[PDB]
């Protein structure tokens, strides 16, 4: 089915065109709040902003802006929060967002250092005995354990609100070898990572939406979410071969600009869904 | 200061 549709696109070589078409048709919505001058230093990139209508609001009287978007797939019945790699000044906001939205998992698809440049702040503690305190938002963050594998790491974190002294376990799924504007090592590597995120229960509706980020939070994040949603739909529907990837991607881009950043990432998302389908049957 | 290019 989709494999046939996949065979065709590859032969013609129209991936760059199929991709450029999705870009032409992608929704365009105002980003007034993100562009306010008082928020310049809360954005990592000037060409990547959350739409006003889908943005996450911090529950803070001071300034409620964070560069994060709620992506609500109503048919697949799954929500995601896509956001940028936190800045040195927005780490408190990031974890406040995680607390307020009752998220159970955080999916990170970039590395803190890429090509000698800092694409992301060290927003979680690297050592069990060096916990992080965020003074502005009154949150404490402790590394509980980590399990390192060749291409991804799974960390267990404890998030505590210093005001209430509630504590929550946050799972941190970190794909460590996915380069900006590139693709994972293989469909199998991606599918194993996604299936571990799934098996943890972090995408279950009993929790708030999982937080997914990269450096900008659109390219690698879109590849991850597109594949996860398409596989969800194929299980739900009585006609699995029906699911149209480009329609799902365009539905996702109503909530955040730029999801999936290269034609190869788009191609890779098809591959991951095709290969991933064999496990769902 | 921009993601693209």
Numbering used by the authors:
A (entry chain A): 2 to 282
B (entry chain D): 1161 to 1165
The authors write:
Protein Tyrosine Phosphatase 1B (PTP1B) is the prototypical protein tyrosine phosphatase and plays an essential role in the regulation of several kinase-driven signalling pathways. Here we identify PTP1B as an inhibitor of IL-6 and show that, in vitro, it can dephosphorylate all four members of the JAK family. Dephosphorylation of substrate is initiated by nucleophilic attack by the active-site cysteine (Cys215) to form a phosphoenzyme intermediate followed by hydrolysis of the cysteinyl-phosphate to release free phosphate. Asp181 acts as both a proton donor, enabling protonation of the tyrosyl leaving group, and as a proton acceptor, receiving a proton from the water molecule that hydrolyzes the phosphoenzyme intermediate.
Although our structural and biochemical data show that PTP1B exhibits a preference for dephosphorylation of the second pTyr of JAK2, it is clear that both pTyr residues can be dephosphorylated. In order to observe the first pTyr in the active site, we solved structures of PTP1B (D181A/Q262A/C215A) bound to a substrate peptide in which only the first or second tyrosine was phosphorylated (ie. pYY or YpY) to 2.34 and 3.09 Å resolution respectively. These structures confirmed that either phosphotyrosine can occupy the catalytic pocket. For both monophosphorylated peptides, the phosphorylated tyrosine occupies the catalytic pocket. Two copies of the PTP1B and peptide are present in the asymmetric unit for the PTP1B pYY structure, with each copy of PTP1B forming different contacts with the JAK2 pYY peptide. In one copy, Arg 47 of PTP1B interacts with the −3 Asp of the peptide, and the carbonyl oxygen of Lys 41 in PTP1B interacts with the −2 Lys of the peptide. In the other copy, Arg 47 interacts with the −2 Glu (1006) in the peptide. The differences in contacts between PTP1B and the peptide between the two structures may be due to crystal contacts, as in the first copy, the crystal contact likely holds the peptide in place. In both structures, the unphosphorylated tyrosine (Tyr 1008) interacts with Arg 24 and Arg 254 of PTP1B via waters in the second aryl binding site.
